[PDB]
């Protein structure tokens, strides 16, 4: 869905 890196920043 979002992606973990995206959630990271």
């Amino acid at each position: 869905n979002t992606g973990w890196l995206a959630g990271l920043f």
Epitope: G3, W4, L5, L8
Partner: antibody, heavy 119, light 113 residues
Framework: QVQLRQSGPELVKPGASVRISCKAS????????IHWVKQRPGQGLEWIGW????????KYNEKFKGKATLTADKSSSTAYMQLSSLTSEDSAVYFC????????????WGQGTLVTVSA | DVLMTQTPLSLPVSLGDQASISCRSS???????????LDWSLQKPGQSPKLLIY???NRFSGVPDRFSGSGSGTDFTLKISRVEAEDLGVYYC?????????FGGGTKLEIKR
């Protein structure tokens, strides 16, 4: 097993645009990021930007904004990069790299594509 | 903008030696999440980089146990217990806990004679 296959060497005129393909095999294409890395012979490694096919999301390097344009096709599992106004200084090898979830930005690397800009 | 310097630029070494490569960051690269996203890669001439260590200490799939990473904050070290010829190439340190990620300049393993 994980496979990233890239377009093949391009010899382009300055100003003209270029498109590099990156075909993914051995994993759910829509579950991972696809990054792009520039390697100019004298400068080391440089992040261009990412794409996430899951929600078509893109994030770009400031340096590369409006220089690189990242798309992807879901049905062919093929990621593309288009670069626009080609400068002599866009002569580099360009890699596509996929991540490991909750692990690292770049886990599996493509073989690379050599772009040479000259008139 | 986060900055990564690898302190030995060239590392002359004999086959089957102790090897230490340092990597320093311009600022603390421990993410507000908690993790320290730092990677060691090895690039051989004519090839793509290959991930070795990730998240400071973790060994990637299929990486021999001669390689290891340590350190926290800004000071980070890669260690090869026994250098194995296939080990030779350019080692890069990498940061991925700040907005644009940044590589080190790279350390080259070279044969000492």
């Amino acid at each position: 097993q994980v496979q990233l296959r890239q377009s093949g060497p391009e010899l382009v005129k300055p100003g003209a645009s270029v498109r590099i393909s990156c075909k993914a095999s051995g994993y759910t294409f829509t579950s991972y990021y696809i990054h792009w890395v520039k390697q100019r012979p004298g400068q080391g490694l440089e992040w261009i930007g990412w794409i996430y096919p899951g929600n078509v999301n893109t994030k770009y390097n400031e340096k590369f904004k409006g220089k690189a344009t990242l798309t992807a096709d879901k049905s062919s599992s093929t990621a593309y990069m288009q670069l626009s106004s080609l400068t002599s200084e866009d002569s580099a090898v360009y890699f596509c790299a996929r991540d490991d979830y909750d692990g690292a930005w770049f886990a599996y690397w493509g073989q690379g594509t050599l772009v040479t800009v000259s008139a | 903008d986060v900055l990564m310097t690898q302190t030995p630029l060239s590392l002359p070494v004999s086959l089957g030696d102790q090897a230490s490569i340092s990597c320093r960051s311009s600022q603390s690269i421990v993410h507000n999440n908690g993790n320290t996203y730092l990677d060691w890669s090895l690039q051989k001439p004519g090839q793509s980089p290959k991930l070795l260590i990730y998240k400071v200490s973790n060994r990637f799939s299929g990486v021999p146990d001669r390689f290891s990473g340590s350190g926290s904050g800004t000071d980070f070290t890669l260690k090869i217990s026994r250098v194995e010829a296939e080990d030779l190439g350019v080692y890069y340190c990498f940061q991925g806990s700040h907005v644009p990620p940044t590589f080190g300049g790279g350390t080259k393993l070279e044969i000492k004679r």
